[PDB]
């Protein structure tokens, strides 16, 4: 969901993390090198303006591949990329997902929710540690059976 896209010197469309963005052909999207105006459409369409061309020479070159599968059937991988739990399952390109261009989506971490669960983890952690201390205290007391 990192929509912070960028274009390298070769023209490949990557994101802020360096991952190549896929298109309709299921190959990474590559744009013509000498661009002058890049506009992303509402439905992922990429329309470019060749350098020196008039304002009426606007044509689409590629389409961003947007996938909308079942959320509960996805798992986060070791590199932060969500994939299917069942391997070798194709990612079908959905025609309903819309892109709000001109904006970047941040994280959805509920900071207060994290903190109020931190304070619960501390208390439960410390209670179990007291159980460890009362376990060894009982053992020391019972050690007087054999003493004589």
């Amino acid at each position: 969901r990192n929509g912070n896209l960028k274009v390298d010197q070769n023209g490949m469309l990557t994101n802020a993390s360096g991952h190549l963005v896929l298109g309709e052909n299921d190959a990474p999207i590559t744009l013509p090198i000498p661009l002058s105006k890049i506009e992303i459409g509402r439905d992922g369409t990429i329309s470019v303006l060749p350098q020196g061309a008039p304002a009426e020479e606007f044509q689409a070159v590629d389409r961003i591949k947007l996938v909308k599968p079942n959320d509960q059937s996805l798992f986060k991988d070791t590199n932060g990329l969500f994939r299917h739990k069942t391997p070798n399952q194709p990612y079908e390109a959905d025609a309903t997902v819309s892109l709000q261009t001109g904006a970047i989506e941040g994280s959805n971490v509920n900071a207060v929710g994290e903190m109020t669960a931190l304070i619960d983890l501390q208390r439960q952690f410390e209670m179990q540690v007291k159980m460890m201390s009362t376990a060894e205290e009982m053992d020391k007391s019972s050690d007087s059976l054999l003493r004589m």
Binding site: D8, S17, G52, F75, K85, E126, S133
Partner: protein, 262 residues
Amino acid sequence: MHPALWVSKTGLDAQQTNIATISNNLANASTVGYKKSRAVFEDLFYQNINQPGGQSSQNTELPSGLMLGAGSKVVATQKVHTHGNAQTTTNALDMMVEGDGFFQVTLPDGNIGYTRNGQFTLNGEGTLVTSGSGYPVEPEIVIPEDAISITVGTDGEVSVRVRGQQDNQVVGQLTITDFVNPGGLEPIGQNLYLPTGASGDPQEGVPGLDGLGEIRQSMLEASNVNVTEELVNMIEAQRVYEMNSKVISSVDKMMSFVNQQL
């Protein structure tokens, strides 16, 4: 050490870099032709703790498939080369590129540096140089001592008005350079940029054809920094900085409790 301590330390380090990025953006709020930078964050590598191997898709929702992140880092400080506003000046030697293009200046070591700042002047020899360190502007343009006024056309045509002769004399022509990826230029200070592999080979051309920007005389391009973006960015970065500190303090007390109780 305890992994929970280092996870929060990475978040503390990541926000500190973001704070420094914001501070430079506000510091250069008056620099002509300055492009604001933003900090981009990313999550670190995820490790399987309860798995002897790397079978993450096996039971990822079960205790055997638990994966813990390693923190956060700032992947890049991205440049946003948006077009700034216009400053109409009465000086006849400061100029602006409207659109794509960069002024080219000669660095002392030999190579050519590229800038959006147009505050130029002359040296003792009449050569058009920058008003900072005084680097010559490419191509070399020499103003005759007899000139009474200087005119710069929209295509880089630099003309002078000499008393006696009718019509203006042409003393040269300016050129500007465009890059495929402007964000790939490495900033070296002095309002100067250097081409890199991530940017691309320079594409020199007349300023106004082939999609290049036009030269506007007696104008300057203000910095495109948003003084309200930085303040809102400061608010979030300060709060995230404090939230990660509490986790470090919380882990410290939990570890302190264990060796004080047990």
